[PDB]
Design a protein around this ligand. Structure first.
Ligand SMILES: Cc1cn([C@H]2C[C@H](OP(=O)(O)O)[C@@H](COP(=O)(O)O)O2)c(=O)[nH]c1=O
Ligand SMILES: [Ca+2]
Length: 129
């Protein structure tokens, strides 16, 4: 897997962000996670977590997995990094996201995220409380 350059266009919600990649705007869906919808519990906190994390980052990187970089709604599917910290793993670690949507061929960081979910669950953080 390789990290590639991108720049924040706009925060959207817990697990989607509008980025500019190779000079084009694109909405990205965070791989292997599921944040609550805004109007669900911890939804607003998930949005705020992700928003602050991307908005404060001096360096935004996009990391595709091995299969299909686009979803059926045309959203980019990627791992996103804010100054070298993975937003996908960061939400799960805080129990603001669940490991979810684990499709074979786009699952490189699955065990890494499940590790973070185990610890979040262990600490009864947010979603697990
Ligand atoms: C995370 C992810 C979601 N999706 C699709 C499956 C879901 O389809 P359905 O709409 O048919 O449920 C939807 C969930 O996204 P949201 O959690 O953003 O709603 O996005 C993928 O196809 N691949 C993925 O890696
Ligand atoms: Ca979601």
């Amino acid at each position: 897997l390789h990290k590639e350059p991108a720049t924040l266009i706009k925060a959207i919600d817990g697990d989607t962000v509008k980025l500019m990649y190779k000079g084009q705007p694109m909405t990205y869906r965070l791989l292997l996670v599921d944040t609550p919808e805004f109007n669900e519990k911890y939804g607003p906190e998930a949005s705020a977590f992700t928003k602050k994390m991307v908005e404060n980052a001096k360096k935004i990187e996009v990391e595709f997995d091995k299969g299909q970089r686009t979803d059926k709604y045309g959203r980019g599917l990627a791992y996103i990094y804010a100054d070298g910290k993975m937003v996908n793993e960061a939400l799960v670690r805080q129990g603001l996201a669940k490991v979810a949507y684990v499709y074979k061929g786009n699952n490189t960081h699955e065990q890494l995220l499940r590790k973070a979910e185990a610890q979040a669950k262990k600490e009864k953080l947010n979603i697990w409380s």
